[PDB]
């Protein structure tokens, strides 16, 4: 705990995504709605928009 | 016997069907999927992409 | 350094906005999809590392 911020400890977390077709697990905290078929609508199924 | 009419059909056919396959071709970006890229980036980078 | 963990979590809402009221991350660097608009985004398989 003497030297300038060049060699202080830094803790480094590296989150690494795989963004591929697959099952998704990992969501984020957007709500749901209700599923309406017979209408063009826009649509966003696990990310694909 | 009725070759050089089809000739004129399969040019055609295969001019649209390589057009319609150059849309799964990455051109240096991170995906192909426009809706993909508007969504998972910020829009100052997005627009490089 | 050279053991290096790796916790990787599944099947749990990942809320990242948990990590902007934390300690000051000035190193928020992602070199990926996107600093900001990641909450509105679905995840096959999150490994974080440490």
Do not use: M
């Amino acid at each position: 705990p003497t030297y300038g911020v060049g060699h202080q400890p830094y803790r480094v977390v590296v989150l690494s995504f795989e963004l591929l077709h697959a099952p998704a697990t990992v969501c984020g905290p957007k709500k749901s709605t209700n599923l309406v078929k017979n209408k063009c609508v826009n649509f966003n199924f696990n990310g694909l928009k | 016997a009725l070759g050089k009419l089809q000739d004129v059909v399969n040019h055609n056919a295969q001019a649209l069907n390589t057009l319609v396959k150059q849309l799964s071709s990455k051109f240096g970006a991170i995906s192909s999927v426009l809706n993909d890229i508007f969504s998972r980036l910020d829009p100052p980078e997005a627009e490089v992409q | 350094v050279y053991a290096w963990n790796r916790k990787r979590i599944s099947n749990c809402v990942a809320d990242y906005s948990v990590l902007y009221n934390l300690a000051p991350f000035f190193t928020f660097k992602c070199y990926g999809v996107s600093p900001t608009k990641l909450n509105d985004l679905c995840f096959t398989n999150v490994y974080a590392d440490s």
